[PDB]
Amino acid sequence: QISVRGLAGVENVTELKKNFNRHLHFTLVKDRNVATPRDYYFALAHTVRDHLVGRWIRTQQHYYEKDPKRIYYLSLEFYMGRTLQNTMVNLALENACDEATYQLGLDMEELEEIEEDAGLGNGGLGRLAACFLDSMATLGLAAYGYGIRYEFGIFNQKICGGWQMEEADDWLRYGNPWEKARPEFTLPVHFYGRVEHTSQGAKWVDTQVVLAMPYDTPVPGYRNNVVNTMRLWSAKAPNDFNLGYIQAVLDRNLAENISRVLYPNDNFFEGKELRLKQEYFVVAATLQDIIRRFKSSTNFDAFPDKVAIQLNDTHPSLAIPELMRVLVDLERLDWDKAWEVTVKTCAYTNHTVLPEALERWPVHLLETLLPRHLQIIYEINQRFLNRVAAAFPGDVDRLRRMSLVEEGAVKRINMAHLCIAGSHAVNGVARIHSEILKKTIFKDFYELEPHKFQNKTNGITPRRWLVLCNPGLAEIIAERIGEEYISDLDQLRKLLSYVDDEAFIRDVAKVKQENKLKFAAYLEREYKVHINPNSLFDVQVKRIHEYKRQLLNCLHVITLYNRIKKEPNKFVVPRTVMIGGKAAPGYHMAKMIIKLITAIGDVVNHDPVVGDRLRVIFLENYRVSLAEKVIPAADLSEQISTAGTEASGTGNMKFMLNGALTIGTMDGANVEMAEEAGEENFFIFGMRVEDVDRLDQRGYNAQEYYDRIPELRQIIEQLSSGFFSPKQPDLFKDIVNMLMHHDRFKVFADYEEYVKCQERVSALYKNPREWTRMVIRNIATSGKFSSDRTIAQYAREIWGVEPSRQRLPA
Amino acid sequence: QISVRGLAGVENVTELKKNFNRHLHFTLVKDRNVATPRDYYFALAHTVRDHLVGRWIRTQQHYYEKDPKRIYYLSLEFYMGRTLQNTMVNLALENACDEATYQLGLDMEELEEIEEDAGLGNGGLGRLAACFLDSMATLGLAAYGYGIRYEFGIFNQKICGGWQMEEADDWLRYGNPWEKARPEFTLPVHFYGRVEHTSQGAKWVDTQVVLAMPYDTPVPGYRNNVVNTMRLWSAKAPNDFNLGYIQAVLDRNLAENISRVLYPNDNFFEGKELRLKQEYFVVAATLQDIIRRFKSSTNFDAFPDKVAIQLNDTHPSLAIPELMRVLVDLERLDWDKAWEVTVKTCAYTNHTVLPEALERWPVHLLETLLPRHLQIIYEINQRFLNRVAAAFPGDVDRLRRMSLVEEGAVKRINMAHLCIAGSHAVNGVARIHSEILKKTIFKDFYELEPHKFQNKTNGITPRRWLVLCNPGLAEIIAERIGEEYISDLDQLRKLLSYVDDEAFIRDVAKVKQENKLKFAAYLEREYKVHINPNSLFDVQVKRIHEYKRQLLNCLHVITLYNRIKKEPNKFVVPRTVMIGGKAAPGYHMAKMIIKLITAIGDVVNHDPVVGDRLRVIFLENYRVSLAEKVIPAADLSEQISTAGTEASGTGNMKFMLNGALTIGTMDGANVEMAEEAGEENFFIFGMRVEDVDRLDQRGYNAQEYYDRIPELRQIIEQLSSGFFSPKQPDLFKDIVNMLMHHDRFKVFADYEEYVKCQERVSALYKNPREWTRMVIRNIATSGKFSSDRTIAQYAREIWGVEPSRQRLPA
Ligand SMILES: Nc1ccn([C@@H]2O[C@H](CO)[C@@H](O)[C@H](O)[C@H]2O)c(=O)n1
Ligand SMILES: Nc1ccn([C@@H]2O[C@H](CO)[C@@H](O)[C@H](O)[C@H]2O)c(=O)n1
Ligand SMILES: *Cc1c(COP(=O)(O)O)cnc(C)c1O
Ligand SMILES: *Cc1c(COP(=O)(O)O)cnc(C)c1O
């Protein structure tokens, strides 16, 4: 059908069809008379999977022959989403498969909607890992993703009575055709026990053993025949476990619960034992696998030359003391040499500066669960502080500030401090975030070892986030500059020479209109909700959190509503305000924010005077597959976190690449995006980081804004009086109280400028031609935000390996 | 290689090889350089499985088109064993596969040893179900096996320090290539709740829901292209289950524990709630499936004409009140009509008369778990007793004896009484057992409804128990009378005309010698134990239980030992005494019996004076795959249960078909076996049922035998004094005490005659020619014991369907 989707050759279509029927028969054991759409989806998935195996096997054989340096990306989250379409895109089988299923009398798009999302992540951090695996394979790096195969991923969100309800994400129910169990490579992981000091070295004994069973999933690069591996561990009890009889067998669940479910917290630390077990489980099994592969290439001096371990945040920070444990206790290396190897092998990536998100584990927990690791951590701390004391003689407070051990009610281990000490590189995820790390929370560490600190601005893969979700846009772009940009996004700059091209302007605007129509139809299909395709699509999708300020968006919405009710017969640009995202189960304020959003919709969407001029919809169960649908349909991207809180953000990049203009604060990557496109082509507003600091030094008093802004006051009074909750007048008392007395994120401080900026957005939307020209300038300068650029920088500046675009023989 | 194993055509071998490589590559994702024997086993299994699918699909389509009466065999146990070789035998692919793997450079026998046993059973009852499925498919019946897919089957037995140790049977660890999950057919099962009585009928509400997910396994008939289905249910929690957040997800295990593990009891009832849940779980899911299939053929009058439900013991007895519940509460039929349908649909098979094995569930358990079913049971009881009262006016004791409700400390429901009342047929499993049912425990029921009582003597499938495990014997037999006997075992009688044939006598004896050599080699291979292949193989394999009297065997062994020590330089026929079997985890006496056996071996096997004249080995982890190895190698089959206790026995039939002579009591099927072969060709001894009764009436006093039998006294003194347990002189005090004061099975009463009979066995073994001629007379008359004969009788006399030998188009 379309160019970028590959060729539909006669031979290939014929071969796909026969293999499709073969799997339906032999694999699914069904016939065309009893087969259901799900059956057809699986027949197609297995057919596509077959094309991966040959490449998968030779890629791994290749790495064996050449023995390049291996990159191990450790993460407790991999937000993969669906795999079928992505695989077809990277293998250039999309048009062929579409034609083949068409000839078999089936609609491939219908079949793609049957695949469950692999929701093994919470949000940005997990999605970044997913985009990174794609870029590493596309850049020909010998990389391996290592994580946990959760039986239940992020919960499915249902909205009942306007409230979020959670339900188990049983994503493996019908089976996962993409994974391959490798029980032959099962490894043991130890817990509890005690430390015994003998003649030669310490020994960790009397431990409880839990088996780690690996499952491998292929990660295809973009049309280069490279297929890397993502290995996820599953917990299994040994057969002699707890071995009345019946109970012992039933108690096997205790050990296997380790890989049962993903903790649903976004930017928030919960110090539960089960979570600590998951963190060690992934680290212990992974390191054994790494060392095994290394030995099958004694001389650990070359370990750093053949291995690179990237820690996605502090979640897998135990890799540092675990590596030391193995080298010292098992391999018998002296401490100093072991430490040298560890530091040169590990690298740490920080993703946030929010205090409540940093991991600080209670010493009593580590003491009971991992006694040997606690001893190693103390030793690491002791030697680290000796170095600090020698560099800053007499600075006793610096010593207490930099310690890995925090004193107080309960002693805790600061995992971030542990990561900085044991890594040769520490990076932030956006220029401003990395600068904040050096000026604030890690200032002491930066002064001790300035060379360790770097920046690696985040990115997104243009395969899934452009070609896959927006083929219409990828096509009109390819028509003008070719297909090369898909693996070299910087080429989009060439589109700048078409900003005055009347044909292109029309095509860009047409693609957007088509996406909006398709999404508007979807909302009625699966959610039965009417919306005006002609209105401006104002969307904010991301996890619900106070720092992301969905509340500021709500205030604007209510303002628009009050203004209409004030001057009913006055013209206003029609808007469809869409807000979506999940709230962590135990985050009360976040759940109240979702309720407020639906409550506003209940009032606004049923007011006759408003008509189709303003709609407020809450997008239920926001996840990767839904993002691929709503982002291509958006006109306005809301990125309004309080300056200094959103480390980078990645959703912002997805919107920019797909034709949406951005309204946001100078926070995270927004700064670099505005810098690339030009501030005149971005809708910036609000306090800058320096302004927030000034306000804090002076003291933030929300009452002041309430007293001086009539429109704001009216909104707060509506909330308090029950205007949005008739039957429950004080339903939103907590929200008002927080906004008025303890708003850590200064919602009111940016209200005026936000509303003003939004007016400028509406003014531009009234001029179709100029709105589209600004969109073109955004798309044309989004090249820097490709994860291929990010990974190439990690490769050269941290891992010490050269990326490759060379194809492998198919 | 051998005739009975089929042809190895050029086309077939070529096709098998290419498909083998295809699966190794595409299915296992491996190459010949990294593939392990397990990998090769799976490549072969998938290759063989492919040949099943076509036949499997058309067989089921066939039943849809013709709509014959369906047979549903409900059992909580299906002792299947391995599936690879059995599938090849029934599809006539054995020689072709052997040749193909040979050309690929692999030993197929080595690969077959890698497959885990499907140990979803405890012993005879479970194995019978397995043999029955094979015969039903071979006889072209539209039959379905329905059970539970236990995650853990019968435990693996390890022997440590002479004691049994149990370990989880994680048989699904590497995956099961034979099963096909059918999540699309998942059904809900209800538990707890309460009964609500409304205007029209009762309603079962406020129940907890557990999902039943089916897994289908193909059951191929013998070379007739018929492939039936065995559907096993797996427990799954609904996604809204218990829906802090984390705990709710983890608690899903509570519901899924229902299908976690098989209760390891043989001939013993344990009234645990979890077991009751398993029984209802299989019954509820199965009945919904049956009715669904029936409706997809309102007129429930024809239900009995299209459906037959066979209850394997009382384990699935809840099917009776569950069927009533559905017809009355859901379909709205009047009681009388519903009862008529139920009775004509259900049939019950009793497998034992031991009081401790009968199911008697506490009313308080049913009351809490299945409130509606308890009400229905009371109603059934009320109407049943009204019928008894009308037939035997004034006989109040009969009323209390026949009630389904037993009074006492705690009220219980007698499931056996429930089954007789709600079934149109009740059968025993051997002539003598069925007669005992009518004369004793079910005497009252027989007098009320004589027509319901039948006999269906058990049998074993000659495919697995002859062709598969003893190809050498199947071959020499086929050489003389053809291959027809494999599906018509009665033809073995033609072998009677070869009893004087010198060539045949030599071949029969040669096959046995080869089997013994092969097994002797196996014992050293996997268990490192030396044995003399020239000695007589005296084996007793079956679950450990006091009624099976492994203790009587031990007494004989010790007698042989003492006699040798008494007259060292006297000649005696060399013997290798092999005893094997698992003991239920909570059965103390059974565990002490295993310890005694090993202790005897410790003494006997290391006594220089004995030499290679006597060896005592305990066969560890006895299971189906081990039975297929030891039975073909046995010379003497020990079937020595106390007369009246072994309902039928089936191991006895396996030994008879494979060339072993039998020493046993006139119990169970032994009676019919001796009758078929002729008592002169059987080694019968001991009390007959009538003798046991006489002894009980008089009072069994073990002391009497101890006082009058010097040799017996010596043995008891050796046991008591610690002769077999030096470091622990009183280790076997419990055994001695039981034997002397409370032996329910009169071990001493049969001692003298047993020892005497054993001497007659040794005398015959000294004459090779005559021993073999007697063996030939046994093999030649074992035809009656084929499960094809048993099933044909069930079909005609109970289910009302005609068996068919006609092939289906392949
Ligand atoms: N636990 C955490 C910490 C940070 N983050 C997020 O990670 C992404 C990727 O770097 C950032 O772009 C985002 O700004 C940050 O909040 C997250 O999703 N979860
Ligand atoms: N729970 C029980 C009850 C009887 N049985 C057994 O069933 C078989 C098959 O009919 C009989 O041959 C055997 O005699 C009996 O003990 C058993 O294995 N388990
Ligand atoms: C891209 C993405 C995110 C991250 O969005 P931000 O706005 O950067 O927080 C979160 N969830 C999903 C499903 C995503 O695709
Ligand atoms: C045949 C068989 C049985 C039944 O044996 P009996 O001696 O009749 O009790 C038990 N276990 C296995 C593994 C069998 O194959």
Give CA–CA dist B325/B202, Å, rounded: 10
Three-state SS at A254:
helix
With contact defined as beta carbons under 8 Å apart, do A242 and A248 qualify?
Answer: yes
- Report whether B297 belongs to an annotated binding site: yes
* β-strand pairing of B360-362 with B412-414: antiparallel
Residues B465 and B455 occupy one common structural domain:
no
Which residues, listed in sequence order, are joined to residue A500 by a DSSP beta bridge? none
With contact defined as beta carbons under 8 Å apart, do A219 and A230 qualify?
Answer: yes
With contact defined as beta carbons under 8 Å apart, do B108 and B93 qualify?
Answer: no
- The token pair at A67 is 């023995």
Q: For residue A439, report the distance from its CA to the centre of ligand 1, in Å.
A: 20
Residues B597 and B536 occupy one common structural domain:
yes
Sign of the Cα torsion A20, A21, A24, A25 reads negative
Three-state SS at B640:
coil
Give CA–CA dist A204/B711, Å, rounded: 57
Give CA–CA dist A374/A370, Å, rounded: 6
- Report whether B294 belongs to an annotated binding site: yes
Give CA–CA dist B47/B786, Å, rounded: 30
> Percentages helix, strand, coil for chain B, rounded to the nearest 5?
55, 15, 30
* C-alpha distances out from residue B67 to A392, B277, B311, B566, Å: 90, 33, 23, 71
- Which of B780, B460, B758, B762 has its CA nearest to residue B638? B758
| Neighbour count for residue A201 (Cβ, 10 Å) | 11
Residues A98 and A178 occupy one common structural domain:
yes
Q: Does A337 lie at the interface with B, CB-CB under 8 angstroms? A: no
Three-state SS at B473:
helix
Give CA–CA dist A754/A747, Å, rounded: 10
Give CA–CA dist A146/A287, Å, rounded: 10
Q: For residue A392, report the distance from its CA to the centre of ligand 1, in Å.
A: 33
- Report whether B748 belongs to an annotated binding site: no
Which residues, listed in sequence order, are joined to residue B235 by a DSSP beta bridge? B212
Give CA–CA dist B203/B193, Å, rounded: 10
Alpha helices in A449-549 (DSSP H): 471-481, 502-527
Residues 6+ apart with CB under 8 A from B332: B200, B201
Q: A509-545: b or e for each residue (b if 16 or more CB lie within 10 Å)? A: bebbeebbeebbeebeeeeeeebbeebbbbbbbbbbb
Which residue, chain included where needed, has tokens 């379409």? A85
* β-strand pairing of A453-455 with A118-120: unpaired
- The token pair at B196 is 């609500």
Give CA–CA dist B416/B420, Å, rounded: 6
Residues 6+ apart with CB under 8 A from B708: none
With contact defined as beta carbons under 8 Å apart, do B90 and B222 qualify?
Answer: yes
- Which of B606, B541, B596, B605 has its CA nearest to residue B576? B605
Give CA–CA dist A376/B558, Å, rounded: 61
- The token pair at B483 is 């291959």
Residues B348 and B301 occupy one common structural domain:
yes
- Which of A224, A226, A668 has its CA nearest to residue A459? A668
* Phi, psi of A715, rounded to the nearest 5 degrees: -65, -50
* β-strand pairing of B636-639 with B661-664: parallel
Give CA–CA dist B758/B558, Å, rounded: 13
- Which of B115, B131, B86, B103 has its CA nearest to residue B16? B103
List, comma-separated, the residues after which chain B is broken, a break being a C to N distance over 2.5 A; otherwise answer none: 243, 297
Helix (H) or strand (E) holding B513: helix B502-527
| Neighbour count for residue A262 (Cβ, 10 Å) | 25
CA B243 to chain A, closest CA, distance in angstroms equals: 6
With contact defined as beta carbons under 8 Å apart, do A235 and A258 qualify?
Answer: yes
Three-state SS at A64:
helix
- The token pair at A248 is 């012992």
Sign of the Cα torsion B461, B465, B471, B473 reads negative
Q: For residue A176, report the distance from its CA to the centre of ligand 3, in Å.
A: 24
Give the 3-state secondary structure of B22-48: HHHHHHCCCCCCCCCHHHHHHHHHHHH
Are A245 and B586 inside 8 Å of each other by CB?
yes
**Number of domains forming the structure of chain A:** 2
Residues A520 and A446 occupy one common structural domain:
no
| Neighbour count for residue A476 (Cβ, 10 Å) | 18
Q: What is the distance in angstroms between the CA of the first residue and the CA of the last residue of chain B?
A: 25
Question: What number of CA atoms fall less than 13 Å from residue A128's CA on the CB side?
Answer: 27
- The token pair at A780 is 């044309």
Helix (H) or strand (E) holding A577: strand A575-580
Helix (H) or strand (E) holding B636: strand B636-639
Resolution in A: 2.1
| Neighbour count for residue A482 (Cβ, 10 Å) | 12
Give CA–CA dist A171/A120, Å, rounded: 10
Three-state SS at B180:
strand
Which residues, listed in sequence order, are joined to residue B232 by a DSSP beta bridge? B147, B215
- The token pair at B247 is 């705990």
| Neighbour count for residue A141 (Cβ, 10 Å) | 27
Give CA–CA dist B519/A161, Å, rounded: 71
Strands (E) located in A380-456: 405-406, 412-414, 425-428, 453-455
Which residue, chain included where needed, has tokens 């092998």? A345
Helix (H) or strand (E) holding B159: strand B156-160
Three-state SS at B202:
strand
Give CA–CA dist A132/A77, Å, rounded: 12
Residues 6+ apart with CB under 8 A from A688: A643, A665, A666
Give CA–CA dist B405/B381, Å, rounded: 8
Residues A761 and A793 occupy one common structural domain:
no
Give CA–CA dist B107/B101, Å, rounded: 7
- The token pair at A722 is 């029950």
Closest partner residue to A167 among B175, B239, B260, by Cβ?
A: B239
With contact defined as beta carbons under 8 Å apart, do A209 and A238 qualify?
Answer: yes
* C-alpha distances out from residue A135 to A93, A111, A139, A615, B25, Å: 19, 27, 6, 38, 27
Give CA–CA dist A223/A55, Å, rounded: 11
- Which of B318, B323, B326, B284 has its CA nearest to residue B307? B323
- Which of A331, A443, A463, A318 has its CA nearest to residue A392? A443
DSSP string, B290-345: HHHHHHT---GGGHHHHEEEEEESSTTTTHHHHHHHIIIIIS---HHHHHHHHHHH
Give CA–CA dist B168/B175, Å, rounded: 16
Residues 166-195 of B with CB under 8 A from A: 166-168, 170, 173-175, 180-181, 183-184
Give CA–CA dist A396/A465, Å, rounded: 50
Q: What is the distance in angstroms between the CA of the first residue and the CA of the last residue of chain A?
A: 25
Output B208-212 pairs: Cβ under 8 A, ≥24 positions apart: B208/B255, B209/B238, B210/B235, B210/B236, B210/B237, B210/B238, B210/B255, B210/B258, B210/B281, B211/B186, B211/B187, B211/B235, B211/B236, B211/B237, B211/B238, B212/B186, B212/B187, B212/B188, B212/B236, B212/B281, B212/B284, B212/B285
- Which of A440, A781, A507 has its CA nearest to residue A644? A440
With contact defined as beta carbons under 8 Å apart, do B93 and B48 qualify?
Answer: yes
Give CA–CA dist A694/A690, Å, rounded: 6
Residue B260, domain extent:
1-459+787-810
Residues A173 and A154 occupy one common structural domain:
yes
Q: How far is CA A689 from the centre of its chain?
A: 24
Give CA–CA dist A362/A410, Å, rounded: 7
Give CA–CA dist B615/B612, Å, rounded: 7
Catalytic residue, candidates B82, B236, B325, B351: B351
| Neighbour count for residue A729 (Cβ, 10 Å) | 13
Amino acid at A567: E
Residues 6+ apart with CB under 8 A from A223: A90, A91, A92, A487, A807
Does the active-site annotation cover B654?
yes
- Which of A371, A372, A359, A368 has its CA nearest to residue A413? A359
Give the 3-state secondary structure of B782-803: CHHHEHHHHHHHHHHHHHCCCC
DSSP string, B543-599: ---GGGTHHHHHHHHHHHHHHHHHSTTS----EEEEEE----TT-HHHHHHHHHHHH
Residues B481 and B433 occupy one common structural domain:
no
Residues 6+ apart with CB under 8 A from B606: none
Q: How far is CA B567 from the centre of its chain?
A: 43
With contact defined as beta carbons under 8 Å apart, do A157 and B245 qualify?
Answer: no
Q: Which residues of A touch B250 (CB under 8 A)?
A: 257, 260-261
Residues B514 and B641 occupy one common structural domain:
yes
Residues B420 and B465 occupy one common structural domain:
no
- Which of A634, A638, A623 has its CA nearest to residue A470? A634
> Which burial class, exposed, middle or buried, applies to B67 when counting CB atoms under 10 A from its CB (0-12, 13-18, 19+)?
exposed
Residues 20-79 of B with CB under 8 A from A: 25-26, 29-31, 36, 38, 50, 53-54, 56-57, 61
Q: Does B517 lie at the interface with A, CB-CB under 8 angstroms? A: no
Give CA–CA dist B108/B463, Å, rounded: 19
With contact defined as beta carbons under 8 Å apart, do A751 and A712 qualify?
Answer: yes
Give the 3-state secondary structure of A161-226: CCEEEEECCCCCCCCCCCCEECHHHCEEEEECCEEEECCCCEEEECCEEEEEEEEEEEEECCCCCC
Give CA–CA dist A430/A227, Å, rounded: 29
Read off the CATH number of the domain in which B27 is found: 3.40.50.2000
Give CA–CA dist A372/A505, Å, rounded: 64
Give CA–CA dist B201/B199, Å, rounded: 6
**Method used for this model?**
X-ray
Residues B579 and B495 occupy one common structural domain:
yes
> Which burial class, exposed, middle or buried, applies to A431 when counting CB atoms under 10 A from its CB (0-12, 13-18, 19+)?
middle
Which residues, listed in sequence order, are joined to residue A307 by a DSSP beta bridge? A70
Give CA–CA dist A765/A763, Å, rounded: 6
Residues 6+ apart with CB under 8 A from A617: A523, A529, A531, A576, A577, A578, A579, A601, A605
- Helical packing angle, A710-721 and A550-566, nearest 10°: 100
CA B153 to chain A, closest CA, distance in angstroms equals: 11
Torsion of CA B193, B199, B201, B203, to 10 degrees: -10
Give CA–CA dist B656/A737, Å, rounded: 87
> Which burial class, exposed, middle or buried, applies to A694 when counting CB atoms under 10 A from its CB (0-12, 13-18, 19+)?
exposed
Sign of the Cα torsion A177, A179, A184, A188 reads negative
Residues A352 and A217 occupy one common structural domain:
yes
Rg (CA), chain A: 27
CA B29 to chain A, closest CA, distance in angstroms equals: 6
Residues 6+ apart with CB under 8 A from B157: B164, B165, B166, B582, B620, B621, B622
Question: What number of CA atoms fall less than 13 Å from residue B311's CA on the CB side?
Answer: 30
Give CA–CA dist B491/B483, Å, rounded: 10
Q: Which residues of B touch A61 (CB under 8 A)?
A: 31
Sign of the Cα torsion A689, A694, A700, A701 reads negative
- Helical packing angle, B84-91 and B94-103, nearest 10°: 120
DSSP string, B476-512: HHHHHH-SGGGG-GGGGGGGGGGTT-HHHHHHHHHHH
- Which of B261, B119, B122, B173 has its CA nearest to residue A243? B261
- Which of A439, A436, A442, A399 has its CA nearest to residue A420? A442
Three-state SS at A356:
helix
- Which of A325, A266, A310, A321 has its CA nearest to residue A146? A310
Determine if residue B801 is left, alpha or beta; phi over 0 gives left, psi from -120 to 50 gives alpha, anything else beta: beta
